[PDB]
Write an enzyme that holds these catalytic residues in place. Structure first.
Site, PDB file in Angstrom:
ATOM      1  N   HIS A 162      19.974   5.075  -6.685  1.00 13.31           N
ATOM      2  CA  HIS A 162      21.391   4.621  -6.628  1.00 13.31           C
ATOM      3  C   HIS A 162      22.113   5.177  -5.392  1.00 13.31           C
ATOM      4  O   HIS A 162      22.020   6.401  -5.100  1.00 13.31           O
ATOM      5  CB  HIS A 162      22.108   5.006  -7.922  1.00 13.31           C
ATOM      6  CG  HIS A 162      22.136   6.474  -8.192  1.00 13.31           C
ATOM      7  ND1 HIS A 162      23.159   7.294  -7.739  1.00 13.31           N
ATOM      8  CD2 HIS A 162      21.291   7.267  -8.890  1.00 13.31           C
ATOM      9  CE1 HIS A 162      22.943   8.524  -8.166  1.00 13.31           C
ATOM     10  NE2 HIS A 162      21.805   8.533  -8.873  1.00 13.31           N
ATOM     11  N   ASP A 163      22.806   4.294  -4.672  1.00 12.57           N
ATOM     12  CA  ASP A 163      23.818   4.641  -3.633  1.00 12.57           C
ATOM     13  C   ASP A 163      23.132   5.081  -2.342  1.00 12.57           C
ATOM     14  O   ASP A 163      23.861   5.449  -1.388  1.00 12.57           O
ATOM     15  CB  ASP A 163      24.799   5.721  -4.105  1.00 12.57           C
ATOM     16  CG  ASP A 163      25.493   5.343  -5.396  1.00 12.57           C
ATOM     17  OD1 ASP A 163      26.249   4.348  -5.377  1.00 12.57           O
ATOM     18  OD2 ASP A 163      25.243   6.020  -6.401  1.00 12.57           O
ATOM     19  N   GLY A 166      19.072   9.787  -4.931  1.00 16.49           N
ATOM     20  CA  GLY A 166      20.369   9.083  -5.001  1.00 16.49           C
ATOM     21  C   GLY A 166      21.345   9.583  -3.946  1.00 16.49           C
ATOM     22  O   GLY A 166      21.266  10.779  -3.577  1.00 16.49           O
TER      23      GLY A 166
END
Ligand SMILES: O=C(Nc1nnn[nH]1)[C@@H]1CN(S(=O)(=O)c2cccc(C(F)(F)F)c2)Cc2ccccc21
Ligand SMILES: O=C(Nc1nnn[nH]1)[C@@H]1CN(S(=O)(=O)c2cccc(C(F)(F)F)c2)Cc2ccccc21
Ligand SMILES: O=C(Nc1nnn[nH]1)[C@@H]1CN(S(=O)(=O)c2cccc(C(F)(F)F)c2)Cc2ccccc21
Lengths: 257, 256, 257
Positions: free
Chosen positions: B119-120, B137
């Site tokens: 994520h991200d 992440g």
């Protein structure tokens, strides 16, 4: 029947007697599968690839794919697999490169456990075990009865000697001599696979000659040339010690110390 | 072109040239641009945009939700650029609202088997993630960065442009541009001199960077002392500024 | 309906009424799925296996396959998963061996992230987290609230203590006592999971008692039996310290130091 109708068999593909292909499996062009070999479900085979007899390939495996590249490049490149091999869930096996052998080669009675990677132009002998997530970068030679424990990383061109053992999480940058046990990142030689010698029914004379052979190479401050000379007599009496001497002789770019 | 055994969601959006292999799922709100080949056995989930002339290999899960417990079902995105190769079993998770609600991948990136892009994470261009690389992440990977097999990156770490990580490296702190790191925990060793020659850097610019490394790593300075010592070399060589800029933006420390 | 028509449900399979199964998933013979459980697409379930209620299993997972371990000879062994478990992309869970208790066991509320491996005869309790590519070799007991971060490697027969933490890329050859924090290959004891304890609401008095119990085992030159004896007082006073002392008492491979 043995061929699941949900599998895609390319018209060029060749299936021998007693071959099973599970559902949603792709047996691509120029893939040849030997007698009594079992392809599970969700397997991708790509060619040109030859697979021998009584093999077992588990779901999510990609067997005979191209080596990774931003563009398609270099074929015809082969993958050859012998007989009585077990290839477990999600294993990746790449074909060779036109530059080097143009062939990835696996022998007989090998166990390749889940999510192991066999890189382009690698050669596996017989009776080897690659434990979960073992990665052979490419051009890696694994000799008979060698065991790579879980998440063993092997650099390009490294030779894994017969009956050798790499502890889990090992990262191997240099040749592992026959019988030698290595551990850590970077990999360090520790001892010899005495356990494995006894399970092969090695005479206790051969095992004792192999213990002294370890000490000659690793412990006495010798050059490799001095070691090879000091081992010459032992190697002549015991074929087992000769496998060891040969693994050291063959290491031009150096051994795991 | 679209294999009839693929599931294309009504709200998916595919350009004419797009190929979808059998038993692949193009989920709700998945954009796929011209020239992109989706292999068989691929799960695409949205909201996700995939650019052009991309290749996604079998068993890949691109655009799934993070299991990270701080995610609670927000409509976060995943953007992928052009001429990217995503290999067997790669996992790419969408962003979280706690950051920018976007996972971003640029152009010409080679993402090899079983790599994780958490994520991200922001990947730029001409990057190489070798087999089983994991970005935990919020990881920023800058252009031409190479992460060798089974490289683990902790959350929020920045991987500098033309940096290289050895296989089995575990990165806890930012890697400055050009720097080579190895081991668990990761430690600075040298500069990616190959990468500089790949790019056709002036032997001036390489010599300037060789010096710049010594200023930061080999001359027992502090980061502040080092930044000031570089500011002139940085002003003269745009190549050296990339290095110095990567050290300044490292607010949580550099890999030493 | 909730069973995708492209899925394969074995006649002998027992599915509760509201069980969802995605396309090209296989629910094999002697597989039981409890109410609320969602199976994604491209999942392989082999039995004999019992999956409980409100579990989620993601694509490319192989749940209930035979162990490749050479001692397993096709005996009818079990896998049991409890309730409220999330199993992410590409997870492998093997069933047990008759050499142990013929069962692999997972409790409730466990998060098992992508490409994690749970070997034969492993016992996971409740509220555990296995982060990406964690591998339990076999016969591994993971007690409640244990966290294993990404690419954590666990040797056969190792016990992972309750509320224990293992850092990214850790390689565990010995027991991790309850609450203890380990890092590296090989794994090293570096204090306790105090942030874990404060988060799950452990009392100040209990945390202070665990702090002294740690000093007794690790920092006082005591052999294990000398330490177990010294803990006897504090273990009688605090449950937390008893769980700690109990985890040390039940170490068969020694403890991580
Ligand atoms: O016995 C052994 N001990 C040992 N490993 N590393 N250092 N010591 C090795 C390792 N294993 S294993 O542990 O059961 C196994 C199986 C699946 C996954 C893993 C993991 F990924 F490492 F976690 C390990 C399989 C195996 C098979 C024949 C001979 C020797 C071994
Ligand atoms: O050279 C390099 N890494 C390195 N050197 N020393 N320590 N780490 C990387 C890695 N490779 S690789 O070895 O051929 C390779 C490929 C697949 C899997 C693996 C494995 F998983 F790590 F085993 C390795 C591919 C590659 C391609 C262009 C540029 C740089 C690299
Ligand atoms: O927070 C944490 N920190 C930490 N791990 N090791 N050392 N420090 C761990 C790890 N993380 S993570 O970084 O976000 C993560 C997620 C997926 C993949 C990976 C990777 F594969 F290791 F790269 C890492 C997930 C997680 C979830 C609950 C509890 C603790 C953790």
């Amino acid at each position: 029947s043995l061929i699941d109708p949900r599998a895609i068999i390319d018209p060029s593909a060749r299936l021998a007697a007693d071959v099973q292909v599970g559902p949603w499996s792709i047996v691509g062009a120029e893939v040849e599968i030997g007698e009594g070999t079992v392809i599970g479900p969700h397997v991708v085979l790509k060619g040109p690839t030859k697979i021998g007899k009584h093999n077992r390939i588990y779901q999510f495996s990609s067997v005979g794919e191209d080596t990774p590249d931003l563009k398609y490049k270099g074929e015809p490149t082969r993958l050859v697999i012998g007989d009585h091999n077990v290839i477990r869930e999600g294993v990746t096996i790449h074909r060779g490169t036109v530059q080097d052998r143009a062939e990835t080669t696996i022998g007989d009675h090998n166990l390749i456990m889940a999510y192991a990677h066999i890189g382009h132009d690698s050669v596996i002998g017989n009776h080897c075990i690659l434990v979960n997530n073992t990665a052979l970068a490419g051009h890696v030679h694994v000799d008979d009865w060698a065991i790579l424990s879980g998440y063993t990383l092997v650099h390009q061109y490294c030779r894994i000697g017969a009956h050798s053992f790499s502890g889990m999480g090992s990262a191997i940058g240099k040749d592992v001599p026959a019988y030698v046990t290595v551990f850590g990142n970077p990999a360090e030689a520790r001892s010899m696979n005495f356990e494995g010698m006894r399970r092969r029914g090695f005479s206790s004379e051969a095992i004792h000659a192999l213990r002294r052979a370890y000490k000659v190479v690793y412990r006495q401050g010798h050059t490799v040339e001095e070691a090879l000379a000091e081992l010459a007599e032992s190697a002549a009496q015991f074929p087992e010690v000769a496998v060891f001497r040969d693994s050291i002789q063959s290491a031009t770019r150096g051994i795991t110390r």
